[PDB]
Every structure is written in structure tokens, then in C-alpha cells.
Amino acid sequence: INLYDSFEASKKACDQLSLGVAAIFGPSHSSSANAVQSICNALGVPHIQTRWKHQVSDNKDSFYVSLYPDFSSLSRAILDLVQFFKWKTVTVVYDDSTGLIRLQELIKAPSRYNLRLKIRQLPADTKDAKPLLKEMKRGKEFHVIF
């Protein structure tokens, strides 16, 4: 299948259910994962997710599992690692916009502790980290979370 065509995901899931399968191993892509989750929850099909996706809390689907570890516990581990290292200034660099939804309580950590924070975002081009790394050098910031 192609990239980010959830209509094609629904069509090929309909074709595989027309064949009939015991379970569906879904994609690693968020819109197609949401479409296949609606498909399987409305049809009584077990569906497996292997990559993390953004989950809407108001969605009432319970017909899926996510074998990727939940990123809230990873953020708890990252906060415990930062609190072990006794850091005070932490720069956070994220590429996709869902990383802020991923890194939740790391952003919420200055409310709970004495940890000053600043974030920066990578641009859409891969090579253009040189102004970002130049900003890291110019800011004298020695603790980078990627």
C-alpha cells in the first residue's frame, strides 16, 4: 500500500475481510491506523498495532492492542533519567509535531520541579539542522534531548 491513503487502507481491509482473516496486522501510519481501527471495531475483528499513534481520548474503540510501549511511561522514564542527572537547563528537539503530544510530562515538568526548559523544532529539510545546531552552540546549552 501507498503512504497515508486511509481510503486505500479501508478498501484493502475490506478486501482482506472479504477473503476473511483471523486478525489484521495494521499499518505503522496514523491516519490509516485510525481508519483500520474504526474498520475492525465496527466489524468485530482483532487488530494489532506495532507503532505508536496519537490516540484520541474520546474514541470508544476497545478492539485493538498496541505492542509499541506507551509513550507516557517512556516520558516517565525520561523524567526519571533527567532527575537522576540533576540537570537544570534542558533543550528538547523534535521533528514531527506529534512529538509534543508524545513528550507530554517532560514539557509539564517545570511546573513540578526546578527544571528550566526550552524547546526547538527541526525544519522540514534534513540538511537544515546546521542553523539549529548553530543555535545550540550559540545558546551554550549542553543538555540536548532528541
Add this chain to the structure above:
Amino acid sequence: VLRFGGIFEYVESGPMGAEELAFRFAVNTINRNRTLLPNTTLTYDTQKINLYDSFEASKKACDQLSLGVAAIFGPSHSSSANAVQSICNALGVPHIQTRWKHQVSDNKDSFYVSLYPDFSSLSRAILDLVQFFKWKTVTVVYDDSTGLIRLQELIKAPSRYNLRLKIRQLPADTKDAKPLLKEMKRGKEFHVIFDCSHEMAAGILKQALAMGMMTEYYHYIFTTLDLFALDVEPYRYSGVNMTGFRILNTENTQVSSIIEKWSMERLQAPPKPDSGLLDGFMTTDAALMYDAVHVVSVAVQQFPQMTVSSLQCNRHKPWRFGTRFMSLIKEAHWEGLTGRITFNKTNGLRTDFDLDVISLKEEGLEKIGTWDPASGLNMTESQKGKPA
């Protein structure tokens, strides 16, 4: 003779949702005026959709395309609008979005136009407002985990300027925000940016009035655009600093007449006076849906050869007149209820608009300045002290 695919969420209530009634009001008010589309009438097909079932949205969109529509009007949820956007991008029919949704940068779609103001421009307006108000420690309080990407230009803003952002999350209910407000009071927080619905804004205002937060020491900024529909009667004499944004251009007399004409039809629907909200006010979603139907009709008026054909979901033949009609959509300059309407030529998002900076005085809610993406922030009250 054309048809429009309306997809709206139903409640098993007395009246419908305000989006569906605004859609019917838009169709009736456009078909009443012979100035707009004099040689072609407009029909529609509403569909009542469930709570977060994008497969059911896909099936009802497939039924609407089996009927065949000129254009579709998507729902407010993120997942169902993503499914409708994928289906309409595959079949070439235009898709019009009213609620903001999260977009993925790696999604190569072009058959979608959202008339909601972009939260990057809204966050830049919030950054201009907080730089005018000269705060240093701002607490940003968001509603749900999708609220961070609506404020992601604000959280990147302390890279460039001296600003502290202790960011806190609202709990699962608004009535359980009392420990959050105790933690807010204990931390000596005084400048709070709220990003939620207007219902959650009224709930957090009642919770703060139970908490005694509204003194002279507190400034509240709201990212929501339904601030004018709130009830500020038991808050105005307390002497506080509530400040928000109003996309709805209520200054114009014809716009206010259209608002009153829709509001008298809303009087069949009773209000809930215990919620702390007013009644007889057009929401931003309903006004944006009305303006969306107006912009689509303006795009129809430049197309004399318009023909609606049926389509099938099992074959990927696109609609025939999709490209020229989509080109007619993205060059519109129609003056609606929300002022100027002009989409981006690269995204289709409405990233250029006009904003009314409304604040709270003891007289009531009052406009004190204008905001635009080009000149930034005007502030007509502070512009009165302009020397020669």
C-alpha cells in the same frame, strides 16, 4: 440544480446540532437571494453521524457520492474528517472543513479547504498580545493532549524571548479543577492562557469564582473565539483582566441583522441557564459553516458548466470537473460573517484574516484593538496616544 453532502453529528435531542441548522439556514438564505446564483437552485442531503466512527463516516460519504454531490461538508472530529479528506482526495470532489484538525506534513492531499483560522497565526497573535502585556512568567493551561500543537508556536517562543511557560493540563472533568486551582494559587500564578472550549471556559470561570481567583491581580487570556458568547455579568464588577479574540465581525449592521435572523430561529431550542452561557448567539462553527456555504456558492457562480454526476467507491475514477472547481475555490475573496476570506495557495488553510481584540471592563466586553497577520497588532485604545 446541485446537491451538497452535509455530514453532522446527532444527539437524539430535540433540535439538531447548530452546524446542521446553520447549513439549512445558509441554503435557505442563499436560495432566497436572487443576487447569488439566479439560474441554479441548490439542494442538499444531510447525514446524521455517530460519535467517532470514521468507518460510518466513510460509508455515509460513499452513499453521498453514490448519490453524487457538488461538494461535501465534513464533520468536526479529527479521524472522520481525515477519512473524508482521504476519500475526497481520491475521488477528486472538494472537501470543506469547519473545525480545525491536526494535519500531517507527509500527507500529499490537495482536495481540502479548512476555513478555521490557523493556530500558528493565532499563536502569533497570542505572542503579540503577551509581548504587549509584558509578562515574564505565563502559565499555559490546555484542555486535551491535542492542545499542545495548537499552541506549539507559543511554546517555541521562549527560544527567542525571555519568557517562562509552566504548562499545566486540565483534568478529565472541569469540576475537578479545584486541585489545579489550588496548585495555581500556591505557585503565585497570575497570568493564565486558557485553551479549551467555551463550555470549559465557563466551567473554569465558575471554578475560579468558587476559588476566589478573580481579583485585580489576575489576567486571563483565552484562545477560544467564543468569548463573546460567554456570560460576563457576575465577573465585570470584580475588576479583572479578561482578554480574548472575536473572529465574528459583529460591528457591521448587516452581519448583526443576519445574526439576529438566525438567532430568532434558534429560539425554538431552549437554553441551559445553569451552564453560565448566554443564548441567541451564533457560534464560530455555525458562522464558519454559513460562510463556507457562501464561499462554495461564490465558486459555483464562476462555473457555468457545472454538472453533478454519481460516483462509485469501488473504482478510483475521479470526478470530472474537480480541478477547475478547486481552482475556483482557492481564489475567493468573499466577505462573510468572519470578514475577509482568503485561503493559502500552498495549504488551503485560512491563514489571513482579521481579529478583534476584545477585553473585559466593568461596562462589559469591549473591543480595544484589531489584529492582522501583516501589520501585527494595532490596539486602537493604545493608539490614541499617538503624537504628531
Add this chain to the structure above:
Amino acid sequence: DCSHEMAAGILKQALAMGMMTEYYHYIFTTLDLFALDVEPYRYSGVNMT
């Protein structure tokens, strides 16, 4: 120093005017303070006596 009805109206108008902070310690000479509904006036740091 008033009746409890006037005291309740005064407290409602003072809550409407934002007089319910930690910096207010109102003492009521009336003997019917217990008859007031103190539930909206709680969690505000006032000290009714």
C-alpha cells in the same frame, strides 16, 4: 451588623465584586451565621467569624 438576610445579600454582592480573598476577615454581629449557605464562599481564604 445587620440581619442575616442583609448579611447574605452583602456577601453575595461582595463575592460578585471580588472581595473573597485571603485578605478579608469579616466578623458578623448577628447570631444567625450558621443559617447562611457558606458553600459558594468556601475555598476562598476568607475568615468569617
